[PDB]
Symmetry: D2
Subunit: 333 residues, 4 copies
């Protein structure tokens, strides 16, 4: 059971902890967040507006955060170099602050005795992995890796299946995406991204994303064949992917449904989901899949030009794939 420290006890940091506890695939032994002290951590982890009260016990005791009788070391460092992950026993580190996405910044945890670091975001230079799509290309020389973005984890498993069976000539993706922490309650300053500063609950907000091009990194055959953009809308969680693509081989929509469902029951089970029910976004709150294909929502213009819809819990789905990737990395040591 690989021991894990979390840097950044935010949405992703706390839900990784819930998924680590829930699945037992990894063990959280240390947490670091300079803006959330140990008593505050008890509160932030126990109560959750989106995913509900934690089902379990959580207390502060002898300076450690004790969750289900298991004590966790709490640090309060702003500079990742000064965290002593080694003496806390943390071998792997989840880099879920949002501000250390480069190998040089993420490498700071290796000074502290961490063995490897998993950035919970896309990186400019760290190798990116998507469970079920290219994770087997991880090898032990990579001490710093990225689990990509939540959108790419929705789009790449779907894209994998469509391209393997039919061939994607080209594709454009829109993601209608839930609100996140970088947004603003009311019109306010947002530096380089003026749209993101506008009132979160008031607006549909266009945003730029590299998540679709990133699919070309996890699936090299799709390099230069996909891009896309995003709309942020006033919901607290759960997001949807809309992939308009042009297929090489003609495929009836029922054929797309059969290979996607088949893949959801086989090698991609737990990653790629399939449904034909009249779902809406709240039906995926706390759903641990990366991607759930929505058979009824999509629509074909003809056998070579289709629009495919897939849901994802950007918070809890992505957190479960951070856990899965660390479990798999542990298994290749």
């Amino acid at each position: 059971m690989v021991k894990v420290g979390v840097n950044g006890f935010g949405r992703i940091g706390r839900l990784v902890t819930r998924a680590a506890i829930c699945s037992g695939k990894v063990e959280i032994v240390a947490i670091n967040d300079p803006f959330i002290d140990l008593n505050y951590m008890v509160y932030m982890f126990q109560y959750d507006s989106t995913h509900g009260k934690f089902n379990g016990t959580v207390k502060a005791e002898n300076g450690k955060l004790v969750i289900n009788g298991k004590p966790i070391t709490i640090f309060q460092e702003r500079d990742p170099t000064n965290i002593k992950w080694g003496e806390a026993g943390a071998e792997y580190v989840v880099e879920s602050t949002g501000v250390f996405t480069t190998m040089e910044k993420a490498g700071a945890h290796l000074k502290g005795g961490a063995k490897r670091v998993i950035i919970s975001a896309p990186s400019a230079d760290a190798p990116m992995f998507v469970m079920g799509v290219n994770h087997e290309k991880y090898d032990n020389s990579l001490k710093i890796v990225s689990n990509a973005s939540c959108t790419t984890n929705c789009l790449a498993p779907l894209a994998k299946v469509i391209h393997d069976n039919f061939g994607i000539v080209e594709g454009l993706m829109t993601t209608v995406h839930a609100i996140t922490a970088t947004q603003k309650t009311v019109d306010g300053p947002s530096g380089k991204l003026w749209r993101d500063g506008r009132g979160a609950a008031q607006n549909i907000i266009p945003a730029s994303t590299g998540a679709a091009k990133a699919v070309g990194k996890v699936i090299p055959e799709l390099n230069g064949k996909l891009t896309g953009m995003a709309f942020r809308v006033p919901t607290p969680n759960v997001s949807v992917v809309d992939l308009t693509c042009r297929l090489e081989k003609p495929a009836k929509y029922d054929d797309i449904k059969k290979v996607v469902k088949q893949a959801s029951e086989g090698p991609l089970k737990g990653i790629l989901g399939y449904t034909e029910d009249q779902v809406v976004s709240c039906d995926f709150n706390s759903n641990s899949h990366s991607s759930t294909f929505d058979a009824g929502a999509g629509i074909a213009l003809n056998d070579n030009f289709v629009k495919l819809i897939s849901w994802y819990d950007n918070e809890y789905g992505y957190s479960n794939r951070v856990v899965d990737l660390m479990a798999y990395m542990a298994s290749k040591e």
Copy 2:
């Protein structure tokens, strides 16, 4: 100006009333709504959560709705065949109830001596017109007419410019659409449309729309080449079109911007807009355009495959177009 009766004093009926008064192109003289009495019509027309309090006077005076000194006859009839449009002097009738959208049902208004009917919705069998696209196909023999859907009025002006300049081989459309009256505040019964019954402000809700199909009706050359679907999101008003289309002729994104903005400054002024600002949805509330191209939000994959974004105030833009079509129909008499 032609004298108009309004059947259904809902979102569209009251905003069509506002658009007439504001523009002065047509004159409301009569209104029918069996679920809203005269005093309640003073309240619902005066106050508006989305567009604000009406700027002007509105009162109940001796059985008439008096707006800025002008009296409007009020009817309370469930069956359109019993509305006495002639007596009130109403020559055209805007059918905006949502429940009389076929030729046979909307024709009931001619028994009451109205001369023409304009259905504020798509119709299965009435001729469909869109200002700036095919409205010069209207002729005086058509007594029952559809102004199509808000989404069709957004997409068809943009498609027209693109198809005229580069050729649309095929296109798939998504509209992120604000909430409407057919939705529910909490999970509740929704007849044949299960997703529509789910809590409106809690969910992204996939939905069908034939708006993209209906462009093939106002632009016959694109018949069979466009379809799409919708996402209902939790905002009060303003919607956005997301069109992914294949072009015949290679088009750089700068060339698309230029022909669209050229269209907006010329023959499609007031109908198709153009902006390069970092807009969000609220910036189009109470905007009277049919469609506003967002130059920074869209994205090209290559010279023949692009995604184009266009905003539309689904309430007030559409209502202005109903007015415009009636003024145009009037000028043809």
Copy 3:
């Protein structure tokens, strides 16, 4: 194990069904709702935007809704006298349609062979009971009863503790309350409650409520000493009571906290809760208490004039009280 039919498979009817199964205190055998056919009930019972996917199996089998392997008879009657509650073995009927709240109208269920009716709302003439306050005044001569309102089940337990210990001279209550099914997604017609027609997700909407007055009926010593009003605010669920009362005997706040906490762990356990944590409304979603005293949110002016705050899940708290009352009435036959 009393057998129960549900009239009205809405918010309350489906959470009463859920609470019945989850608690085991009563057995649902019959459900009637002319607007939800059998396949639609599978869908509406299984997916819930507010409370999540039902944790168990639900399917349609041989004309029966089969929940956790137990089949339930489905009726589709609009007139209650045509429901054959007797043949389906329903002994008690939960009247949760919102449109049969008086004794003459709710008595229609006795024609079909039901032996008692529990109206899931206030009633003009049927006797009202609140669990933990006055439920022991129920006796076997009463075949039509009302379980009052959600707000009354929150207010009455707190008001009982405060009054039994310090005497309430007079009190005024505001409840800040979540969206309910009678509200509209956008400004639309609302019969005689005009403010209720305005866009639910955009507005704070003042509203009348007889809940505070009704406490005088379940606590007769408080007759004519309490009234109040409501604000409907854009949340899907969970409401809060804000009670401002004059006391007879001087009471410092910490003494009010002490006796309320003591009540919450004694005879009002499971009905009246108590907390000192920094809670907000989502921390009570799917909470089964009638009323949770919020220690840190209240405030006193002096020892005789205080502002008391209590949270309640207006959907799930109330539905459990319906189930609890029917188990109590069954035990007394």
Copy 4:
């Protein structure tokens, strides 16, 4: 017109600017905000999610922000001691950052040449003024003043009228308050105000407020007779006070209505409003009154115990009062 410099170009800062231009009572000549450069200021002033687009011109030219052709000097300083207000002609400074609310901190603008400072918020030690209530107590020796909070500006005009006619023995106040910039879009860190950290659009959030107590500063006869608390709710703007008070002299609700209405038509014109319509909060967006009595929402228990209800646009009503106070101060020089 006194020349005014604005420190903090946020909700209040920008809307004070709008109000100043719309009313012509003071002139804006300088703005300081180190987190919004010139070109971004053009965008943030031009577009407003809550209040609509600026009706007028705004552009950047020669390093100045030019609004309706008049040039405004732009500083980018984090320490108010370094702002050269005097050189830019700014004689009064609106301190609207939220981080310099004491006299020792707000006095920092005096070293730059400003003559007086108006803190846009409550202050621990600066004299507070509420227009229409105690503004005549201002005199020219006062160089650092406070315009109190939005809520105090709503409560004090009403309290004044009620107290001058009937005598307030004691009162308790709840404000149902819209979201502000200090809150979070999702559950995040919030110092020692833990509840303020929870998802703003997801929750009813109880919060402390000094507003009712502050009424005792602007109306000394009521010192120590008022307190209360707050509920933050998911609306972008407009708030409501709920004052529960005991009266000394008996007052039937009609008498309360009558004196509030005559105050709103006389001395408190433009500050205290009166309405009997079925209003909801959106009906007060961009309303410039401090406080609008809602006659139909309130309720009396008896002739000495009553609950009074008053709306306020916390953004624009407060902003207009900052302009009114500065104009009144300028008339006194």
